[PDB]
Design a protein around this ligand. Sequence first.
Ligand SMILES: O=C(Cn1ccc2c(=O)[nH]c(N3CCOCC3)nc21)Nc1ccncc1Cl
Ligand SMILES: O=C(Cn1ccc2c(=O)[nH]c(N3CCOCC3)nc21)Nc1ccncc1Cl
Ligand SMILES: [Cl-]
Ligand SMILES: [Cl-]
Lengths: 122, 122
Amino acid sequence: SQIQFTRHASDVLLNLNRLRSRDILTDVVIVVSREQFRAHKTVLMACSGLFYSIFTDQLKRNLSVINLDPEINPEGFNILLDFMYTSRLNLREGNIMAVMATAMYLQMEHVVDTCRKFIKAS
Amino acid sequence: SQIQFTRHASDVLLNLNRLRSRDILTDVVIVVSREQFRAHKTVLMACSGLFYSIFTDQLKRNLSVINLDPEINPEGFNILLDFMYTSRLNLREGNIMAVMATAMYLQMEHVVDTCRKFIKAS
Ligand SMILES: O=C(Cn1ccc2c(=O)[nH]c(N3CCOCC3)nc21)Nc1ccncc1Cl
Ligand SMILES: O=C(Cn1ccc2c(=O)[nH]c(N3CCOCC3)nc21)Nc1ccncc1Cl
Ligand SMILES: [Cl-]
Ligand SMILES: [Cl-]
């Protein structure tokens, strides 16, 4: 019965990404080997089982730095972080295995499923 | 060239609303006369000119309480806050004028335009 605004969610996500690009109200640094990426915990939680599980725990909720597994490919992580904030996933033959393994680690099941479909179509 | 996830933005917004409902990582209380509403500043900024302008200013960015104009109808505000987190706007004959005036105050231009269309269709 409510009026539906079809573009609203995408508009919100766009603006959250704009805030990320200006480092406004970002509240965590994700360290992946020699690279670091800032983000909003709320978005990470919305998009990742790993981050949801980390930040829902009152023991870790207030952490401002998260060190990921050193084995994680920083580029794979970056691709997934960008996907979180844009809805667009950059899969290529050169990055498919790194992105897929990283998505497994981040517990992003729908993305893992999409990587499986990409492999199947390759 | 990137794979588009058509439901992703709405999924993110849904999960942000779930976090709001559990008061997880909310960082501001919006006081509207005798009522109060918690939220995430990032979402408020994404959806409102007023909140964008308030929290982008380094003078006010860290405020944890915002007192709105006492004249603002709390129900009108609540309807708009729910819209921010859901994409669904509950317009009715009983609330149209309060919602519209509140949307003007919050500088939510697309919503104001929609209220004008509602008035025109009434
Ligand atoms: O749902 C997510 C995050 N999210 C996105 C994809 C995805 C996924 O594929 N799996 C998991 N989990 C969770 C932890 O346990 C194992 C599986 N979470 C995922 N956030 C969430 C859920 C409920 N209210 C608020 C929030 Cl923010
Ligand atoms: O765009 C908005 C918020 N938003 C939503 C609707 C709406 C609107 O109708 N008007 C205005 N303004 C802004 C202030 O000046 C007057 C008009 N902002 C609006 N956030 C935003 C913009 C750019 N990067 C990051 C962010 Cl979060
Ligand atoms: Cl900030
Ligand atoms: Cl919290």
